[PDB]
Amino acid sequence: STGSATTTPIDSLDDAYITPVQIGTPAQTLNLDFDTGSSDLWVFSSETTASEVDGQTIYTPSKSTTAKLLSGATWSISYGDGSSSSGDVYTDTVSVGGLTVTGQAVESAKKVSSSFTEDSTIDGLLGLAFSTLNTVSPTQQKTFFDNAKASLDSPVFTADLGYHAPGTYNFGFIDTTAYTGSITYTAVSTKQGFWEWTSTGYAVGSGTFKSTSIDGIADTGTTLLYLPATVVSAYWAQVSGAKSSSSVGGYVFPCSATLPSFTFGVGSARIVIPGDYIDFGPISTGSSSCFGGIQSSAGIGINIFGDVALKAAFVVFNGATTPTLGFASK
Numbered sequence: 001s002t003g004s005a006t007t008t009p010i011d012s013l014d015d016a017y018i019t020p021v022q023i024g025t026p027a028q029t030l031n032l033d034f035d036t037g038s039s040d041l042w043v044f045s046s047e048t049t050a051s052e053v054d055g056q057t058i059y060t061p062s063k064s065t066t067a068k069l070l071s072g073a074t075w076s077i078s079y080g081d082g083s084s085s086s087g088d089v090y091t092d093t094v095s096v097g098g099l100t101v102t103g104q105a106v107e108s109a110k111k112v113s114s115s116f117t118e119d120s121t122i123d124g125l126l127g128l129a130f131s132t133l134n135t136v137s138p139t140q141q142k143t144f145f146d147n148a149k150a151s152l153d154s155p156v157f158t159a160d161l162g163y164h165a166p167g168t169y170n171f172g173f174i175d176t177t178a179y180t181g182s183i184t185y186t187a188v189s190t191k192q193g194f195w196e197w198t199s200t201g202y203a204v205g206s207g208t209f210k211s212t213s214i215d216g217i218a219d220t221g222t223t224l225l226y227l228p229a230t231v232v233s234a235y236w237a238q239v240s241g242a243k244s245s246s247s248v249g250g251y252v253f254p255c256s257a258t259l260p261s262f263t264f265g266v267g268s269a270r271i272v273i274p275g276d277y278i279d280f281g282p283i284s285t286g287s288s289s290c291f292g293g294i295q296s297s298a299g300i301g302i303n304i305f306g307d308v309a310l311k312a313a314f315v316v317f318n319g320a321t322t323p324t325l326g327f328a329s330k
């Protein structure tokens with residue numbers, strides 16, 4: 001089997017991407033944030049505290065003839081941005097882009113933090129990291145991908161995120177029309193539960209490439225590119241007037257600037273992030289100070305190749321017995 005679904009930016013900045021997902025019988029379609037940095041599929045639901053729902057579409061398990069309470073199971077997750085959610089668990093039929101999994105754990109939110117409430121466009125998350133990170137207790141549950149894997153034509157999924165445009169998540173096949181040149185594959189460590197890999201270095205604009213190992217995670221659920229302070233300082237030093245602002249919470253730059261590109265290494269290959277991809281617009285409406293798309297990972301404890309990086313590439317998440325990651329230009 002295979003699946004193919006379009007993923008769409010939630011706003012004009014590509015803060016996140018939503019992908020329609022069918023849950024239950026008859027289908028209830030919710031727009032979920034596919035997150036390769038976590039491993040829970042959770043949804044706004046009929047059980048979510050009413051004051052914490054503000055425009056989201058909810059899953060109502062009582063209206064699904066295939067929903068079953070997973071008795072005794074609870075979940076609770078905290079994300080890198082400080083947001084969180086928790087609740088109980090049902091199993092139900094879940095389909096993405098034509099690919100169907102029966103008995104998928106669907107984690108029903110009883111509580112969500114303010115950031116989730118305030119984002120009317122995201123109805124929940126679909127985790128695509130390794131199932132060892134799944135938070136369901138006392139019986140850990142598998143991700144949608146892990147459940148689907150054996151039925152897929154090939155044990156892979158791909159992320160093809162758009163810049164200010166829709167893109168695609170494919171399951172079970174590699175669309176050879178969706179990228180240019182060749183795909184370069186690189187080793188993955190699953191030791192922390194992430195799609196963790198090591199970039200071979202970077203360049204800023206038309207500058208020389210610096211060969212240096214940068215260990216980080218491929219994370220579709222993080223908006224920006226978070227890298228070591230040395231790398232980030234070298235980037236922003238090429239933008240007149242750019243500075244790190246503790247009050248704003250990162251690097252800002254004059255909105256009048258033209259940003260340089262940023263290149264990262266994948267083995268001997270190179271992925272180029274255009275300057276425009278690094279512009280996250282005015283810090284507040286009407287401001288002439290703009291927020292940068294490359295930020296320091298110091299304090300986070302891990303480097304994160306978030307959407308800013310991933311949307312510059314066609315990315316293969318290879319879930320073979322020894323997982324690997326592939327990157328192509330597009």
Ligand SMILES: CSc1[nH]nc(N)c1S(=O)(=O)C(C)C
Nearest residue numbers: 223249280281282283284291
């Ligand atoms: C990607 S977060 C962001 N992008 N553009 C902004 N203005 C913001 S913010 O959250 O208001 C803050 C970090 C400046």
